[model samples]
Target: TCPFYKKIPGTGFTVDAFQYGVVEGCTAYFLTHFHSDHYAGLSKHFTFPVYCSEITGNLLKNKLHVQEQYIHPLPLDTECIVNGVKVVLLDANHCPGAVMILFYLPNGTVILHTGDFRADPSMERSLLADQKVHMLYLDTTYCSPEYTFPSQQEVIRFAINTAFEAVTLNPHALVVCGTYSIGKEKVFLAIADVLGSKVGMSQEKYKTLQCLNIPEINSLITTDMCSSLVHLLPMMQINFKGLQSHLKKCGGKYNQILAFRPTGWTHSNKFTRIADVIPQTKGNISIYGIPYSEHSSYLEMKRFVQWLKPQKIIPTVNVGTWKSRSTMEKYFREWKLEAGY
Candidate 1:
């Protein structure tokens, strides 16, 4: 009986790291970004010297709070030899600390891995041109035409416009919009710039901004500073039945309040109850939607694959399900043929 398991060899392939067999060690395992999905499994199982950019290393240590022993920070655009394999790090503009890894093998094979990257005008010019890439692992989370990502500036504009509308419609209403703790800092700055004044932020967010070297974005108002014009306050410690007391402290005096809720949380039953507590009079409360997603849109992914012209493209991060596999395979096959690969 030639079962699938029976045909498997004891010492299978060239690159091997398995429990039953002596692992034919890889040259290096290059990590392109600091997202949990990409780097989750490696920390527990693999002990290889993982390489990433300096900023990414700092983020892995400071932002993600990863242990120091696992990371090896390498400078951007610099090439280093790790376990006899040459590794290079390039700028990935998806977030503050993101990177693209290029692996150069001894046998002249080159692998380019774009880890959760987006097409930023600044980084596109520096990408490798006309190079023969053996394997290109792409970020294909969004590969359909239906999925679309607005540009950074566009999203910022939308946030500003929405906030302005909320303020204009209800002179006394509080507007709230939620974004990610780490990556949505830029959007927050944009909103602040549009407001041209201070908005409330949590103590933790204030501390995070300071730690991240972004002091100008903090909106913490001291007691002495409370008399000055309108102020923004973070919506922390307001959850429970004590909302009435909290509102009494911040409601009557303040002309308007704007609260930012995390994306998708607003629709949940828990958040709905919290939202119910907040007064929704004309100028009392308004919810704004400004989500900051790092994954590329479907069209962006397709365009990226078309531009890269890789020999073979493999999709990672989003795998396993049959529907997902089929969807991705369809795009990959179409784009591969179009790229003349």
Candidate 2:
């Protein structure tokens, strides 16, 4: 099962490893999502046959300018043949176009590759829970016990209330959210809709969201910065310094700023109250680190592994260092033993 990090053993398939160049036996390339880390090496010159979800394929064609002929957008939860292997795509519960791939090999072996996912409860009732998988390629982004955060709805509710309070106190305050290119769209969407505010973002990001084909986005986003109090910026720019720079660029149109940095790393399960989640404040700029992660928590991963009970499990993320891999493998062993597998 451990032929290579990028290659799936005996399937002639490679996933999310376009930058590593051609693998020896790879007949088909699969993109799990449109995240930059996953599709780094792919370009207009890429020649391998690629399969991905419809939204990801659209982003590949429109955003990366990749040849459309090389891109095949597979329907979700449907069986299709690629390189003589039965393939299915399941919603990853990650970014907009992210998918977890299911492969049924001719040799009767089953492989499930979760490409960057947040293992939600709905997945526990999906087809995968009933299927006996031989090899499971897991996304071990939060493999440790300490990373268990609250559910998406719970966190989003806190954010919406917090934003409402901020705006209520200072009606002209600017609310900024930090996010990746695609993930965390839900957080800001919930904030904007709850606050009845339009979202401001760059045209490039606007086009990316347009490709996602989320119906309500047409009325929710605006290119004019002055038109909307809620703005979406890159995650790296949600800091105190970052917001200060942005406010300066705005020519003091907004004096006070309320920014949200949403990710799992910002949260710890030890916190009992909503107010316990602290904020980094510096004068007019306040940055709240919200526990709004796109990746699975430790409990979620444990639940997924225990239910699936795959014969073998391998991690897709945090495999770079020996220590990381070993730590994840330890969790795998503990989880497997609990499942009595």
Candidate 3:
């Protein structure tokens, strides 16, 4: 439930203060996912019952340890009534536990919120066909035309191919990739699938994989467990230059290494300095560029807007008003080009 206000001082438009406080008589507040931006303020202010999908509930329970009494988990596409407002949760395939919420009021007003979604064609086709939306709130983090991004599968494939090539060229080389513990289980799994052998991950990453119950792909070694792989030690430690020297001294028999640092060397100017630190060996050092991301790209946003067909569209995250307004205008122009109306 959100406190309804007539107008915000700066924006001169009505706004919902769900982040501030819950409205006295409002029955439910629907959460789109467990992402920090979507659920960050919930624990501080929301005393009322929060609604979300079952998977999202499990994720929040496991990750944040939120109280179960305050949560009401619903299955996808099932309608539930609270304070005379009908709410439905639908799959948002950005991550394992993401969802889009549809709110239907008795007055025939319908609001659709696509919470932190990517336009993965296989997962979003049904959502794009929805036609009853009156107001649409979208995840336009990368809505500007200048910020184009590749698909998740494409990025995964690139990482796998690069890792395979690097390891094959330097048979006893270490390959390390930097990624957040909770969010990078999929990437590790993809890499393992490509190599058909176990890859080492940090302990924090191992914990995340265990929590997610993805044990089938848990063929990972950690820093503490390097004793078993010490014979092949040079290919065991994959990190920055600092870790590379340590592995070289550890009776490791390898002349080359492949490390995956989680930074955009392609876009950043700092990569020149990083490139200078590579050690000359029989195999040349290559920095692989993989466009991995958690959000939708500008082109994906445009396609989603065209599909949803809402009376009014609003963007909530990322430089809110000015950027959102510009994107709204750009999308309408694209719509005009397609329909000539």
Candidate 4:
């Protein structure tokens, strides 16, 4: 289990601990994903050898320009021995190159470390069923009951339908999507596909997308701002004032702007349905904060814990506050009883 954000007990390997400086007895470093928070302290000057998925390795090399000698890219689902410890990478379903790591210590201890993941049925059917996972390092980004949101497919469908309807109702309206460098990509991709529109983005974002190697999304992105009716921008730029300024830059070609900001932070239990969550509108611009997250929901996380029934659980995020940490501990304790452990 991770006592801190970095170290994994009884092993030389440290997960996402670059910012923590050199850990004593740490020889092999493992990176679960390429997200900035996870790989923050990594640089060309850092000398420790790293292990990660092939796509993550590509991003580290091309984007961060990390040295080739230190980047060890491992294939997915294959067991590889590193210093007599068995490690396997499983699809995390969070973003490109993200993986849930499975570690098999020489003493027959099995550990499952989910770097950041959206719980799915496929995970329940994998090799995890055969072995007893002694410890589970989870991504508890949305561990509270109030954080429940719809599934990824449902949210993607909602985005596509909503965006299509908005554009169809007003022919001169522009549709914009808020996105991060790595995650929340399915929303914009689905919308562009349904709208028969290419996505306009910065040259840098386009290059990053190309590195993702998602074939279907290849021709859907263009650097030309005017070429597409839909544009992808940073989350902060999807607001009304930002849209207004962008419209002025476009010389008032678009009469109205509709922006969809996909994130889990906007979700609440009060709104039972996704569509019931209201939009924030200002004059000619409207922004919708959709409950689309790559992380597992409260129910999803609960189900995973009950089903997996790991002997112990360690949370990765949102455990800072006293209330937050205690709430998670209570949830885990209840789950333990329910799972017959």
TM-score: the better of candidates 3 and 4: 4
User: Could you give candidate 2's per-residue lDDT for residues 292-325 as a string of tens digits?
Assistant: 7789888988988888888988888888899998
Error (Å) of candidate 3 at residue 33 is: 2.5
Clashes of each: 13, 0, 1, 0
lDDT of 4 by residue, 1-341 (tens): 33475676678888987887787889899999889989988988888889999889988888888999999999897889987788889999899999999999878889999999998878888878778999999999888888777878888877888888988999899888887768778888888888888999998888788777687666888999897988988878887788888888777679998898887756354555886666889998888888877888888888888899888888889867889889899999988887787
Worst 10 residues of 1 by lDDT: 6-15
Instruction: Please give the CA lDDT of all the candidate structures.
Output: 0.54, 0.85, 0.56, 0.85
- TM per model? 0.70, 0.94, 0.73, 0.95
Mark the 10 consecutive residues where model 2 has the least summed lDDT.
Answer: 266-275
List candidate 2 stretches off by more than 4 Å: 1-3, 267-273
Q: Sorted by TM-score, highest first, which candidate order results?
A: 4, 2, 3, 1
CA deviation > 4 Å runs, candidate 1: 1-30, 39-48, 63-70, 120-124, 165-175, 198-256, 259-283
Q: Rank by lDDT, descending?
A: 2, 4, 3, 1
Candidate with better TM-score, 1 vs 2: 2
* Worst-scoring 10-residue span by lDDT in model 3: 5-14
Candidate 2 or 1, higher lDDT: 2
